[PDB]
Amino acid sequence: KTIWLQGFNNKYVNSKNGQGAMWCDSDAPQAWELFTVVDAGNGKIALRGNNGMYVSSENGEQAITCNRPAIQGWEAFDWLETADGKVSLRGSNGLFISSENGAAAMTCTRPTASGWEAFGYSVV
């Protein structure tokens, strides 16, 4: 299934076509804002961006990216949802992807999920 991800700032997660760090900075979802939800095994998922690569948590040591050709330790996430159907994505470190409210590159550094880590989504 293929989705967009709308952050707390009402902008959309952007793969940046694998060129550097991801940002939640797009006004509307188009090609670079679409991610295919792939089964990563053991009930986890990976997110494949427009460039065919996978989103990586980068161990929470730097901003997340969409440049890996394989699911190799930092690319598997738990899909966790709020009551109204927003999604939070928990990485290998147990930490959540954050939109950072769009004023910084997206990270996977936070151990709890609030607004900045909650994303609206639908299936395309």
Author numbering: 450 to 573
Question: What does the paper behind this entry write?
Answer:
Carbohydrate-binding modules (CBMs) are non-catalytic proteins found appended to carbohydrate-active enzymes. Soil and marine bacteria secrete such enzymes to scavenge nutrition, and they often use CBMs to improve reaction rates and retention of released sugars. Here we present a structural and functional analysis of the recently established CBM family 92. All proteins analysed bind preferentially to β−1,6-glucans.
To probe the mode of binding of CBM92 domains, we successfully determined the protein structures of the C. pinensis proteins CpCBM92A and CpCBM92B by macromolecular crystallography. As was predicted by sequence analysis, both proteins form a β-trefoil structure comprised of 12 β-strands arranged into 3 subdomains (α, β, and γ), similar to β-trefoil domains found in Fascin and CBM13 proteins. The binding cleft Arg residue in the β-subdomain of CpCBM92B is found in subdomains β and γ in both CpCBM92A and -B, but is substituted with a Ser in the binding clefts of subdomain α in both proteins. This substitution in the α site leads to a substantial increase in accessibility around the glucosyl unit’s O2, which may permit binding to oligo- or polysaccharide extensions from this position. The α binding site of CpCBM92A differs from the other two in that it lacks an otherwise well-conserved adjacent Arg that likely supports binding by interacting with a glucose ligand and by creating a topographic ‘wall’ for the binding site. To probe the respective functions of the three putative glycan binding sites, a series of modified constructs were generated for CpCBM92A, systematically altering the Trp in each WExF motif. The loss of the Trp residue from either the β or γ binding site (W523A and W565A variants, respectively) caused a major shift in apparent binding ability, with the loss of the β site having the most profound effect. This indicates that for CpCBM92A, the β site likely has the strongest affinity for the ligand.
